[PDB]
Design a protein around this ligand. Structure first.
Ligand SMILES: OC[C@H]1O[C@H](O[C@H]2O[C@H](CO)[C@@H](O)[C@H](O)[C@H]2O)[C@H](O)[C@@H](O)[C@@H]1O
Ligand SMILES: OC[C@H]1O[C@H](O[C@H]2O[C@H](CO)[C@@H](O)[C@H](O)[C@H]2O)[C@H](O)[C@@H](O)[C@@H]1O
Ligand SMILES: OC[C@H]1O[C@H](O[C@H]2O[C@H](CO)[C@@H](O)[C@H](O)[C@H]2O)[C@H](O)[C@@H](O)[C@@H]1O
Ligand SMILES: OC[C@H]1O[C@H](O[C@H]2O[C@H](CO)[C@@H](O)[C@H](O)[C@H]2O)[C@H](O)[C@@H](O)[C@@H]1O
Ligand SMILES: [Ca+2]
Ligand SMILES: [Ca+2]
Ligand SMILES: [Ca+2]
Ligand SMILES: [Ca+2]
Ligand SMILES: [Mn+2]
Ligand SMILES: [Mn+2]
Ligand SMILES: [Mn+2]
Ligand SMILES: [Mn+2]
Lengths: 237, 237, 237, 237
């Protein structure tokens, strides 16, 4: 199966696959069952921001998700990603809905990876930023239900003509280029990612969440990964 | 045919197709016959640096090529690249040899494009930088004779195991992701590129040169574009 | 006197000192009488954005000012700023009112200078960005009437507690650190600046405008440089 | 006294102020007695690189010091810098010599601080890079024995006409502008710093080290801070 490191913004507790019993942010290393979570109060209809930060020095994958009112949830997990990810990866955003639903709208996404040193501050680096997505976003690989619109947004999961989110949707957006996420001579292999998102639901409960993820270059949506699997995993192991 | 904008470092004066009677740098818009050139003293076996700058406001494509001794040639050409390039492009480096030859070694290559908007610092951007190339540089599309080495370099044209350049060689390297080079909504679209190169020859005369180029996304080396055509054009028109 | 290079957003046509007979953006090299202007429709109470671009290769100072409705004015002037500016400068924003007035509110300001060299990507660079200003913005030198607020803005000219702009006001904000704007060794010296602004007036006519400027490091507001002199010049020569 | 957070490259073990008994890198929070150290093999006469990385999310101050051959020393310390540093700081490089000596030459220094969010990926940020220092480096505050030369380097401590390092020298270089290192509404306050350095000694033992440090804006060299105090502290508490 794919190799996945993800930071999940998990709006729906699936307590029989180990979610805590509240909306939460989580760090997922090779399992949907997050290695670490923190409670997260998803603010329906507000634009949120997620920041994901890793470097090979401190070896701590960190994420914060905030809303403009200042509410924030942070999670960090000590992990040497050199030991989990392949050298080359693709980076992406994923989301899903299941029985319950939500819009999984991305307003913006930036990513930076840097491989530094072996020497004077020379470097291999990739940075992209999308503050507006285009209807035909050639540098994004859209998978499953993900679309880009003329509203400048990326709709990770399905939305109806009347703006209403659909169930059992899964969608992703990967940056087109593979990313050299580590390289054993790099003294520092850092990455960081920021996305802004708008999760809205009129469901009794929003679901299922959004994740930023890093995968093998050829990663595709695992079949059956709607709902609690977030477009990321073939199963809940 | 492809659409090409290029900055050529032309080491071989083909005076019969409009080259000046010296090695030169030039700006190429849809033709190998540069709209603008400047006399360039290629320094054999020395590491040069090429910087290429454009923005949609000044509408001036500029390049400078310099060497460690301080010698520099610059060429600028006023052009509205919105009227020439497709909205999405790929960017690359190209090089050729013909009857005369030279190493067309790239030691580093960076590129930045930005689409800035009617707002603030909300920007779409791609930035990459390669200060070392890997053998399996998965974020480069290698065409023709181009290879990436264990020496950390990009050899655009064929070099034998003994280190000698070969003639009638052509090769390019394009960044894997398409680039959104202009977008009608943007107030400023800018790009910049830098690369460092080492052109060495022990021929009677070095040839043919290195270009940074921007092309249609599906650009391939035009058939028979070795020699004076720099791997960029099907003919010398 | 100070040495000034500026991009003026001139909201008040002082036709008696060479302004065109409309609000305009202009490029000012050592004089309030712009070397180049373009007709600019200042949109009262709307947030505008100004981008200023220069590099030492193209030698073209460019600016564009736009508003959210898409209206845009651009002005470019060919000039070799090496021949005008001192090697070290301070960069700033300036604004004035006179008999007529307007808020000269800056909501954001970024600036990048780079000196790139005869080598690779070895570069000296300064980059700052302010998307919010603090009350005690210790990295800004405020001159004259300029203040920074709790509203996160930079008020270049005096605004009363009731929110009303005042006349005969002048103020500037310079970044605290001097900037190395050119250096003889560098192959490329470039800068760019962006700022966003909100010029509101309920006067018979707004005046006088906002400038981005670059000055000698020890620049102060010239005495009596309110009104049409934009806080940049001692006289209208 | 000043408030100091530093990353020390401590070439001389002063085991009666708690150094371990080998050259080491250390994280210093408000004491020269590092909260954490790692053994470091300083390679005499080679150019080293130090990277220092912090973010407010993972709350882990990290440093790696490497040499081109690949040898590396890393240290990380979990610390919430919001609770140690003032909001505004200056950033600098410091070094000293004592009874024993070394050159404390900085070849380059970059710093980035970013305050992100409360919102969509807008930001206050400062980045500078010096890959070459100038004889009169106006954007550096040189303190004590620090000088910049025409060789493009910063000599933190004293060197004689014949290139030989002197004892009981202390010197620093601070970036001229204060830095807003944290701000309580910032969802992410990150900084990173890289310097390359050349420590050479013909002493029986090199001393005393180089540090990157963050201090109160008005920080100056504490009197008596040569030697083991590294220009950073008034004493060894
Ligand atoms: O009754 C069938 C199941 O419905 C829920 O699970 C689905 O809906 C969720 C979407 O919010 C997803 O997390 C999940 O993957 C879907 O299968 C319910 O939570 C399950 O317990 C039920 O078996
Ligand atoms: O500087 C001239 C160099 O290039 C020439 O290019 C022409 O030669 C071939 C004719 O069939 C083609 O491969 C090529 O595309 C022509 O335009 C020549 O080949 C070389 O002598 C020179 O190095
Ligand atoms: O657009 C004209 C505006 O500025 C004018 O500026 C002149 O007025 C004063 C005369 O003593 C000086 O303070 C100033 O420097 C002059 O150049 C005028 O003050 C205003 O009416 C207008 O808003
Ligand atoms: O004999 C006097 C002291 O000399 C050494 O300490 C000085 O030299 C060192 C430079 O390498 C510094 O670390 C120190 O601050 C200087 O005071 C010796 O290590 C000390 O034990 C002696 O007291
Ligand atoms: Ca879940
Ligand atoms: Ca030619
Ligand atoms: Ca005027
Ligand atoms: Ca010590
Ligand atoms: Mn979960
Ligand atoms: Mn030519
Ligand atoms: Mn004017
Ligand atoms: Mn120590």
């Amino acid at each position: 199966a794919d190799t996945i490191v993800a930071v999940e913004l998990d709006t729906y507790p699936n307590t029989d696959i180990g979610d805590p019993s509240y909306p939460h942010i989580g760090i997922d290393i090779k399992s949907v069952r997050s290695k670490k979570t923190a409670k997260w109060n998803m603010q329906n209809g507000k634009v949120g921001t997620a920041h994901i930060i890793y470097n090979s020095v401190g070896k701590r994958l960190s994420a914060v998700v905030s809303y403009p009112n200042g509410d924030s949830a942070t999670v960090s997990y000590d992990v040497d990603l050199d030991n989990v990810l392949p050298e080359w990866v693709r980076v992406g955003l994923s989301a899903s809905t299941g029985l319950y639903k939500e819009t999984n709208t991305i307003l913006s996404w930036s990513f930076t990876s840097k491989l530094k040193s072996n020497s004077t501050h020379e470097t291999n680096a990739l940075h992209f930023v999308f503050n507006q997505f285009s209807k035909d976003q050639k540098d994004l690989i859209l998978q499953g239900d993900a679309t880009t619109g003329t509203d400048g947004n990326l709709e990770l999961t399905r939305v109806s003509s009347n703006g209403s989110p659909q169930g059992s949707s899964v969608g992703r957006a990967l940056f087109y280029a593979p990313v050299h996420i580590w390289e054993s001579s790099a003294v520092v292999a850092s990455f960081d990612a920021t996305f802004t998102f708008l999760i809205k639901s009129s469901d009794s409960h929003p679901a299922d969440g959004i994740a930023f993820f890093i995968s093998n270059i050829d990663s595709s949506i695992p079949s059956g990964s709607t709902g609690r699997l977030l477009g990321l995993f073939p199963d809940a192991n």
